């Protein structure tokens, strides 16, 4: 039920022979399961924590200069040296300075000239590095039991993901993840700016063009290419200056356009990512799937309601005797002749007689009836379903495609039963995302755009190898157009 | 001499009093006090909306939120007339003076 | 659609359509009209006075 | 253009193209920015709210 | 039952408390206390000096 | 079983500050949101604000936005409301109330079930 | 605010009806309707949230429903103990709470 009301919800239908099915969980979205004699249930990823952070290193966004110093030197006697010149917290410079007879020297000609300065760093940003072993990973285990804490919350560590929850009358659900192959965070650091953190790519973080510390480094003087974060000027070739930039906290905003923000104030919460976990569900059960009818009367308490998903989602309140009962509820038509639409909230059961019960159903399109209860007395409800099966299969198809652009191989095992054509198809598709990711790697979306087209052109005027071709394009015009960034 | 102030740009910026208010689908765009004066930066976003959130209907519904921005440190930009400006050359013959 | 005292049964978008000044219905301060250029005209005869 | 310490002689065009909140120099309250959306983000991690 | 008000629609106006004020050209824009309030209408155009 | 322990009543003149203490225990403090009523004797109910203990962010009516503080404390399970500058209006009893927050650690939409509990509640009496 | 009747009366073992009115914003809008019962010296207590629906351990003799800007709450059977002050509650749009008046309820002897 928690997962009614979700834009990101998906379903996935059917068991093998082992009642097993692969499922993939994603941050801010969430699956519904259900099989032929199973209870359904809901599957939610709501949280990543990381316990052991280690710092990589410390990036100075801003600084100050102090102790400014200069020496000079009369022309072709080499360059100056200073004592702080060694001194590497004191950045340095060596330029060319005019000098002659009025700057007390004898000869005429390019005198040599440096300076140096304290460097001094105010505040900085912290990249925290972690061991795939530290993460932590939380599952809600929430069925469709249509009460009004509900749900199991159990916890995925990358050393034990074998885990299994108890479900009061279900049973239990076997639930074993595979965290190594979801998100590589051995190539991942977590930066960490005065209150706002973000994950970004750790080959990325280490090349960023600012001074930085050793992670271990806490008297703060082991500065590198203080270079970056400072200037030195010779507007007339007569005396150096050297000067601080500026703070570079917005530039470092700007920098993050495709970095995903995450939560480091109260601990590693993360909120982004997928996770590939694998479903067992041999032992479940429904509750009180023996109960005979409700023959009384019912009246609803929360009418029709349609989600984004073609689904309903009803209340109702049960006044006859005989409970704890069995719902009568069925999607039939207008003169009662066929089956119409199935129970997403399978075996609907009044646990006590004044408990009001959610119940949620699939009706098809067009005209669809609700059947409540027996006569006398028996309720029918008049839901028109807005949309058709064509406009139902496109944007299946629509959102398939996009899970598989976004998931990558991962995509095969969003519902993979284990058959030899998924077998297929996800060695394929992981062939062919690795030459696209050793091919496309950190490069622009409108540039995607372009490089589609380039290659859908050249398809067009070139017959196997102009099929692959456009078909590559098309394929790379989706991918750029679907990316965010 | 005398440069005229013409525009100023804003770099440390700060923002409070945030606030959203929870519009349910099919029922137009929130609205927000707040958004009368132009203080407040604002924006309508759509998000869900349902059971859960005690709404009637099931859907995607608006948002908007708003928060009084006050700028700490700005740069100027200022223009000079050609008439106000101000050359000075020296002037050395060589008399040969130390 | 209501006037003072008559009304009408109207598509919706065509009424989110009309070019005149709103408030989203669950606004009660009355007073902050979007577009209300649509109702306001600026003349500047001579280029002297707006 | 001013700084809190440094300046620039830069083109005036260039400087009216600069993406960031600002008033006129004539203003005194100092506090009707515009574009405002440049210097701020709205952000919508899971569609549940900004 | 239970109408639900989707938009309402400004039908008749009235323009009080009229200001303005110019500035010499080459300065920038005119500037008013006042314009950061949303109630009021206010429009920018190109005067002679 | 979820127990909300309020201090005792207080008397303090008037321009004063009171700091009130509201123990709840049974359950987990940290994933649940605090709230904090008033009612003049006799009178209606009034709403101040609630403290999220996942985050320790602050939200208060817009009538005691400038006057109300609202802290909580991690360790021993309670916040606290810290009231300044008293007025002889403000004499009521002042109630302490729980709902849950969201999945997520935050309390944007609050629960169907929300003031859930109540506690006994606290007299203060201004002269 | 919300407006509601000041006092309610009515005989035992009767059905009675009693009605909160707000605004668009926070009655007319949302689900968040609670009612809450007030003992003379006691803490307050819900007997009614999300009327639609009933909490856990109260009786079925409280049902609540909402009809366009006014929600109603409809008590079965009055009895004795039913004499208490009773609070209409809603979650306002703009994220606030907003209560009604109080009600006290008078059961004839």
């Known amino acids: 039920m928690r997962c009614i009301g979700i834009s990101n919800r998906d379903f996935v239908e059917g068991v093998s022979g082992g009642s097993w099915v692969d499922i993939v969980l994603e941050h801010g979205s969430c699956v519904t399961t259900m099989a032929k004699n199973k209870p359904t249930l809901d599957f939610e990823l709501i949280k990543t924590e990381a316990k052991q952070p280690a710092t990589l290193r410390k990036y100075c966004i801003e600084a100050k200069l102090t102790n400014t110093t200069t020496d000079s030197r009369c022309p072709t006697q080499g360059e100056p040296s200073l004592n702080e010149e060694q001194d590497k917290r004191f950045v340095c410079k060596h330029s060319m300075v005019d000098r002659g007879w009025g700057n007390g020297c004898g000869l005429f000609g390019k005198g040599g000239i440096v300076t140096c300065a304290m460097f001094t760093c105010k505040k900085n940003m912290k990249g925290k590095v972690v061991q795939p072993e530290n993460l932590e990973y939380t599952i809600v285990i929430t069925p469709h039991s249509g009460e009004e804490k509900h749900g199991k919350e159990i916890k995925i560590t990358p050393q034990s993901s074998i885990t299994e929850a108890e479900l009061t009358g279900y049973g239990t659900v076997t639930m074993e993840c595979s965290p190594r192959t979801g998100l590589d965070f051995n190539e991942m650091v977590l930066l960490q700016m005065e209150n706002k953190a973000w994950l970004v790519h750790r080959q990325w973080f280490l090349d960023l063009p600012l001074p930085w510390l050793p992670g271990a480094d806490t008297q703060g003087s082991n500065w590198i290419q203080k270079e970056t974060l400072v200037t030195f000027k010779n507007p007339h070739a007569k005396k150096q200056d050297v000067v601080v930039l500026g703070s570079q906290e917005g530039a470092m905003h700007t920098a993050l356009t495709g970095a995903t923000e995450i939560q480091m104030s109260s601990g590693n919460l993360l909120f982004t990512g997928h996770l590939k976990c694998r479903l067992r569900m041999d032992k479940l059960q429904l509750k009180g799937m023996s109960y005979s009818m409700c023959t009384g009367k019912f009246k609803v308490v929360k009418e029709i309601a349609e989600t984004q998903h073609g689904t309903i989602v009803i209340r109702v309140q049960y006044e006859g005797d005989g409970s704890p009962c069995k719902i009568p509820f069925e999607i039939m038509d207008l003169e009662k002749r066929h089956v119409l639409g199935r129970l997403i909230t399978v075996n609907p059961i009044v646990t006590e007689k004044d408990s009001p019960v959610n119940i949620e159903a699939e009706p098809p399109f067009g005209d669809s009836y609700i059947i409540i209860g027996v006569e006398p007395g028996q309720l029918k409800l008049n839901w028109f379903k807005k949309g058709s099966s064509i406009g139902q299969m496109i944007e299946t198809t629509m959102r398939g495609a996009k899970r598989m652009a976004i998931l990558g191989d991962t995509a095969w095992d969003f519902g993979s039963l284990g058959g030899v054509f998924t077998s297929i198809g996800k060695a394929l598709h992981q062939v062919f995302g690795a030459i696209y990711g050793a091919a496309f790697s950190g490069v622009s979306w409108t540039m995607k755009i372009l490089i589609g087209v380039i290659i859908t052109w050249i398809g067009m005027n070139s017959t196997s190898l102009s099929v692959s071709l456009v078909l590559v394009g098309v394929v790379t015009l989706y991918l750029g157009v679907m990316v965010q960034a | 001499k005398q440069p005229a102030t013409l525009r100023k740009y804003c770099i440390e910026a700060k923002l409070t009093n945030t606030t959203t208010d929870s519009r349910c689908p099919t029922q137009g765009e929130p609205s927000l006090n707040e958004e009368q004066d132009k203080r407040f930066v604002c924006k309508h976003s759509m998000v869900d909306r349902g059971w859960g959130n005690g709404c009637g209907l099931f859907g995607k519904g608006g948002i908007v939120t708003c928060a009084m921005f006050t700028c700490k440190k700005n740069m100027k930009g200022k223009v000079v007339q050609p008439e106000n400006l101000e050359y000075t050359i020296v002037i050395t013959p060589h008399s040969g003076e130390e | 659609l209501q006037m003072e005292n008559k009304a009408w049964l109207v598509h919706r978008q065509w009424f989110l359509d009309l070019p005149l000044p709103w408030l989203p219905g669950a606004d009660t301060q009355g007073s902050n009209w979007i577009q209300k250029e649509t109702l306001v005209t600026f003349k500047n005869p001579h280029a002297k006075k707006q | 253009l001013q700084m809190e310490n440094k300046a620039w002689l830069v083109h005036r065009q260039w400087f009216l193209d600069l993406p960031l909140p600002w008033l006129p120099g004539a203003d005194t309250q100092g506090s009707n920015w515009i574009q405002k959306e440049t210097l701020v983000t709205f952000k919508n991690p899971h569609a549940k709210k900004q | 039952k239970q109408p639900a008000t989707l938009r309402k629609y400004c039908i008749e106006a009235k323009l009080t408390n009229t200001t303005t004020d110019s500035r010499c050209p080459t300065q920038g824009e005119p500037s008013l206390n006042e314009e950061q309030d949303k109630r009021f209408v206010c429009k920018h155009s190109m005067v002679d000096r | 079983e979820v127990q909300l322990v309020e201090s005792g009543a207080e008397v303090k003149k008037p321009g004063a500050s009171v700091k009130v203490s509201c123990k709840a225990s049974?359950?987990?403090?940290?994933?649940?949101?605090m709230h904090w009523v008033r009612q003049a004797p006799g009178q209606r109910l009034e709403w101040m604000g609630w403290?999220?203990?996942?985050?320790?962010?602050?939200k208060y009516s817009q009538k005691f936005q400038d006057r109300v503080t609202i802290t909580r404390d991690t360790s021993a399970s309670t916040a606290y409301m810290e009231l300044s500058s008293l007025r002889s209006e403000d004499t009521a009893i002042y109630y302490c109330?729980?709902?849950?927050?969201?999945?997520?650690?935050?309390?944007?939409?609050?629960?169907?079930?929300?003031?859930?509990?109540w506690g006994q509640g606290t007299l203060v009496t201004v002269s | 605010a919300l407006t509601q009747p000041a006092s309610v009366s009515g005989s035992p073992g009767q059905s009675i009806t009693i009605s909160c009115t707000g605004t668009?914003?926070?009655?007319?809008?949302?689900?968040?309707v609670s009612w809450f019962q007030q003992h003379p010296g006691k803490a307050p207590k819900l007997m009614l949230y999300?009327?639609?629906s009933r909490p856990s351990g109260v009786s079925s003799r409280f049902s609540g429903s909402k009809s366009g800007n006014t929600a109603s709450l409809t008590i079965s059977g009055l009895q004795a103990e039913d004499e208490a002050d009773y609070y209409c509650?809603?979650?306002?749009?703009?994220?606030?709470?907003?209560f009604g008046g109080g009600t006290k309820l008078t059961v004839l002897a």
């Open positions: 999300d009327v639609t």
């Open positions: 509650s809603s979650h306002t749009s703009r994220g606030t709470w907003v």
């Open positions: 668009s914003s926070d009655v007319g809008g949302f689900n968040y």
């Open positions: 109330a729980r709902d849950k927050v969201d999945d997520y650690g935050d309390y944007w939409f609050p629960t169907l079930w929300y003031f859930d509990y």
């Open positions: 049974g359950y987990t403090f940290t994933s649940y949101a």
């Open positions: 403290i999220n203990a996942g985050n320790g962010n602050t």
